[PDB]
Amino acid sequence: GLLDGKRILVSGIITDSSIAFHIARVAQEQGAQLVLTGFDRLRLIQRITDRLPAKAPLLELDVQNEEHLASLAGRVTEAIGAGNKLDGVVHSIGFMPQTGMGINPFFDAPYADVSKGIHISAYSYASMAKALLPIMNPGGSIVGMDFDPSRAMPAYNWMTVAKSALESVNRFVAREAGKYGVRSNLVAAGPIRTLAMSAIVGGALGEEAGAQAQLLEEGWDQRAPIGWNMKDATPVAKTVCALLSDWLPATTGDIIYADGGAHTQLL
Amino acid sequence: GLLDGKRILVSGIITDSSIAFHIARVAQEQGAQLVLTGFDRLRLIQRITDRLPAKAPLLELDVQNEEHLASLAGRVTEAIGAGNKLDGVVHSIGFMPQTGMGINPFFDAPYADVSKGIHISAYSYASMAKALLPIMNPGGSIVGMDFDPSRAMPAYNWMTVAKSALESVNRFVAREAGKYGVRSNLVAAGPIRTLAMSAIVGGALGEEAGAQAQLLEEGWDQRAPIGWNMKDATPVAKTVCALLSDWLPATTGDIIYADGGAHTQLL
Amino acid sequence: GLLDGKRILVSGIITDSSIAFHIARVAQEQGAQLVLTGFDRLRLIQRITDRLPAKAPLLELDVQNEEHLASLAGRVTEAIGAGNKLDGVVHSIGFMPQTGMGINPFFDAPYADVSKGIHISAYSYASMAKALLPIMNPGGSIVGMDFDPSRAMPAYNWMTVAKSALESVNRFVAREAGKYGVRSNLVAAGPIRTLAMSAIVGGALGEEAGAQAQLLEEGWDQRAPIGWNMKDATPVAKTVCALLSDWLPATTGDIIYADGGAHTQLL
Amino acid sequence: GLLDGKRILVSGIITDSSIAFHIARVAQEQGAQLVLTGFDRLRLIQRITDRLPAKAPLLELDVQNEEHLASLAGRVTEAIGAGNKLDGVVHSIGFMPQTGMGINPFFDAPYADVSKGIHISAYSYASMAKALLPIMNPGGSIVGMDFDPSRAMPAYNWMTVAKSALESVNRFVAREAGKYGVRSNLVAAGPIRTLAMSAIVGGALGEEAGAQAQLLEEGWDQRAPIGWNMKDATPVAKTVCALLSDWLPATTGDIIYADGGAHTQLL
């Protein structure tokens, strides 16, 4: 068990194709004992999570809610037992209003929409860290989910900006987490067929956006020297468990590419 | 005259040590005809700008004001004469509440403060572009001011995150500006003794912050293979005029380092 | 005249579609007085260079020849007049044996071939600098030609490795050049139809290589937010003259992308 | 056992403070069965390797020797048993003549010296891959040792250029290795007190070089958000075993920083 006896908080499960769901599953297969957080649709999330290899408390967390944040650590400690701490935290959370994405002009997204997106997608990495570092063990790991924003691309639009912000935040979180002996890192994943991605591909953000997204997926597996299967989230779950383990002890404020190697290849 | 007969909008002048002020001065020395925008203290800015080599209309612009943005192009066209367009736009604007900077813990900046910062420092590059592209000429140039955020550093804190966002925005603005034959780029400057920098160094953000800022300035001139004078903004003004000229016609969505070469050297 | 009264050494002219040829032409249009160097086919190069806007001495230079290097500065000073120095140096030189490129397996290039390539394409930037810095003026500029090697690509193969080396060398040359008040930088160009590129596209390195090169050119203009014309070397000549001018005084050990903005865009 | 029943080739052991030695030790602790290669001083290396947790064949390999390379796979297969293949390959090899390093001027390293360095330090990653890929299993991993060359630094000089080349080579090796289902990646380590590093620090490359190296080590632990112990190679051995394991299946042609997070922090 890569994660034997480690205690890990996992956020961002919404369906059974969530990257968070596969992160959780793999971790439990590797002996981790889990605590889960969900946003808003808790009966759905309970129902979905009942299918994991093992039982795990589910805690409500709206990342934009001050009270949820303020009460989070107490709730976790309650769930894992007093005198016990977390060895790992997983941030698999994101959101951007439609106006900030797809065939909707870049220039036409109101700041209030862009602000909400950055709030949930970037700022919350800092917020969760703030709430949870006090109840983490030395040797601990924090992991967030990333999509390489170092270049502009069609349709991703303002989410790219949110990911750029996130990478920056991750480096500062690394500075804070360090005072606790805790690592902080991001996993940069290739495209995966999830609820959030289904939106885009299915034309809910405009048909041309859906088309560019599809071309994206296809170019990816082409570039990837080992290929890329956008229906299989396991390779990125396995990568996230690696960061949660003891086997990358000298890495922090850093980005790990679980993308088939695509970003290293121009063509 | 590098900028003979070009029409250039310059924002961000607040004192006579503003990077924007030296940008404006150099440009006029190079034959540009200017239009200026200022935030809030317009009598001060008029008074300051009266010292430029030549007269130039001053227009009010609060980057967070919808009406200012909406009316901006009409006001400019009024100032430069109907049937005339802009050949250049300079964004030299930034702001971050104290909570997001210095010895104030990273984790203690409220999102409302961080949001305001990103609004003025990143989002506004898109906002200005949106308002001004319609009245720009093909061959035109947009330039923003940057401070290399690719690594975390003490004290800069949330402004770094804002700069990360800005670089991302710049790449998307490049996509829009391209439809007009207009370039968009950022200048990444070394440390310059300005009002905004005086804050930091002078301990208004905490003494330890002031001390780290001073160490920063010093390491900079050390690393720079040609050195760095933090009292002299001319080298970065000259660099911004280069981008505004016809001599970098094949560059866009890109970052130019006016930093003495510091970022290319580890030690 | 951007380059009025500046004295500039330009290497790498072989035909009239050489990037070096267009660099030279633009510079002379901008008032520079030139000295030229050529490799091996000097009658051809004389004949080609007779078509520049103005007369300019031609000096022999095999970059792998110790004597040429050793005698270079004496020959230049002879050409520009004693007591006169160089304000600029242009490195537009490259070579890689066929074994290191195209459909010829990466693994099948003998080190002796790869060594020759790196010698001429990377190491020589240091060699020229060494020979010429002693006869340069403060305020001076050295410029090399680059093709962004930060990612792997088909066919470019070992030349990519040579370009990676070159970028590294450029940063160290910046350290040396700095002791003289001289800048050193690279221009990263998009694809241009030259003799060296004609090889590749024309199938002399294998048909599949020719095909990947053609796809490359096409994706480029697609990605470029302002487009890209691979038949027009002027935009990169103009960019090289900018670096040779006084208008980027705070840039060194750095890379400037004259690539239409392509590298900033994923899709 | 992270590496249970995997067969791994490890190169670059010279003393018991070699990164390769600690790589080998950790791997065996994790259940790997090993084959070792050494350069030139084989009695020394045998003697040193006798101290590993388990016995492992030692094979001679001069990376510049064509016959060694040509015969390598036959020798390995002989050592691991016919019908058995390698699951992992470790490249922990480097060399640069003194002229290319330290207080010896950058400009004064003869190409023949720089060529030898690049041969052993960069080119050999391709050479080993070429010799060994045919006897590797799908799911396999190749790992090389790196020192982040993205910026210039004192004293490292031409080794930096060699590391720049190596990173480039790694991306192309990823393309070849991919045809076999094999990953290729580099580990970028922080400073470690080894034989090769002892040289530098001890003034054998000049006292000023020794002094800059010492300052380097010190700045490192300062920048590292989790710190850095230059006497402890275990954290980078653990990181190399992670890449050799099944837990980073979607990473290739890539670089992993085992550097305490130093490269992510400016100050």
Ligand SMILES: NC(=O)c1ccc[n+]([C@@H]2O[C@H](COP(=O)([O-])OP(=O)(O)OC[C@H]3O[C@@H](n4cnc5c(N)ncnc54)[C@H](O)[C@@H]3O)[C@@H](O)[C@H]2O)c1
């Ligand atoms: N699917 C891809 O292709 C891909 C690739 C790289 C990175 N990522 C990243 O992976 C992470 C998870 O995305 P996914 O692909 O699994 O989609 P998803 O729909 O399965 O999960 C996204 C998560 O965001 C959570 N969330 C949204 N608003 C919230 C709020 N206000 N408070 C708390 N939680 C909130 C949702 O409830 C949900 O569980 C994201 O950060 C995403 O950007 C996805």
Ligand SMILES: NC(=O)c1ccc[n+]([C@@H]2O[C@H](COP(=O)([O-])OP(=O)(O)OC[C@H]3O[C@@H](n4cnc5c(N)ncnc54)[C@H](O)[C@@H]3O)[C@@H](O)[C@H]2O)c1
């Ligand atoms: N001084 C440095 O060391 C340095 C280095 C690199 C980059 N920069 C960047 O250069 C630019 C200018 O900064 P500076 O050093 O000249 O400081 P400065 O004080 O001279 O100018 C900053 C500008 O922000 C403007 N501004 C703030 N809020 C605004 C709003 N709501 N609407 C419209 N304008 C607003 C101010 O009025 C002011 O003119 C910034 O974007 C900054 O981050 C500065």
Ligand SMILES: NC(=O)c1ccc[n+]([C@@H]2O[C@H](COP(=O)([O-])OP(=O)(O)OC[C@H]3O[C@@H](n4cnc5c(N)ncnc54)[C@H](O)[C@@H]3O)[C@@H](O)[C@H]2O)c1
């Ligand atoms: N054409 C492109 O698409 C492109 C794009 C980006 C960068 N570059 C770079 O631009 C530079 C010039 O290439 P080009 O496109 O003009 O091709 P080119 O054929 O016009 O010029 C290449 C130059 O290399 C010189 N050279 C080769 N071996 C030499 C030696 N031993 N000693 C002295 N000189 C030697 C040649 O004589 C020649 O003039 C190169 O360094 C190249 O890699 C080209």
Ligand SMILES: NC(=O)c1ccc[n+]([C@@H]2O[C@H](COP(=O)([O-])OP(=O)(O)OC[C@H]3O[C@@H](n4cnc5c(N)ncnc54)[C@H](O)[C@@H]3O)[C@@H](O)[C@H]2O)c1
């Ligand atoms: N020690 C550090 O601080 C550090 C940091 C980052 C990366 N690295 C890299 O780690 C790797 C190992 O270096 P080290 O620190 O363990 O020093 P080391 O002295 O322990 O090992 C270096 C290896 O190079 C091998 N070698 C040299 N020439 C060879 C040849 N012609 N053929 C075959 N093998 C040859 C040596 O025999 C030796 O085992 C290198 O590639 C190095 O650059 C070292």
Ligand SMILES: CCCCCCc1ccc(Oc2ccccc2C)c(O)c1
């Ligand atoms: C541009 C076409 C390529 C698609 C990128 C892949 C992807 C898919 C889903 C992603 O998650 C989100 C996307 C938007 C908003 C919120 C989330 C979680 C995500 O962050 C990335």
Ligand SMILES: CCCCCCc1ccc(Oc2ccccc2C)c(O)c1
């Ligand atoms: C961290 C210590 C090093 C100082 C960095 C130099 C600097 C100085 C002033 C800058 O402008 C701002 C800084 C904060 C908020 C707003 C602006 C314009 C700025 O963006 C950068």
Ligand SMILES: CCCCCCc1ccc(Oc2ccccc2C)c(O)c1
């Ligand atoms: C891989 C398909 C894309 C082509 C890249 C464009 C290009 C064209 C010519 C170039 O110059 C050389 C190429 C090889 C060897 C020598 C030189 C000068 C060069 O460096 C780059």
Ligand SMILES: CCCCCCc1ccc(Oc2ccccc2C)c(O)c1
């Ligand atoms: C510049 C001062 C900082 C030292 C860098 C750390 C280091 C130490 C040893 C290294 O290995 C070599 C160094 C030179 C030549 C050969 C090798 C293996 C190496 O590659 C890196």
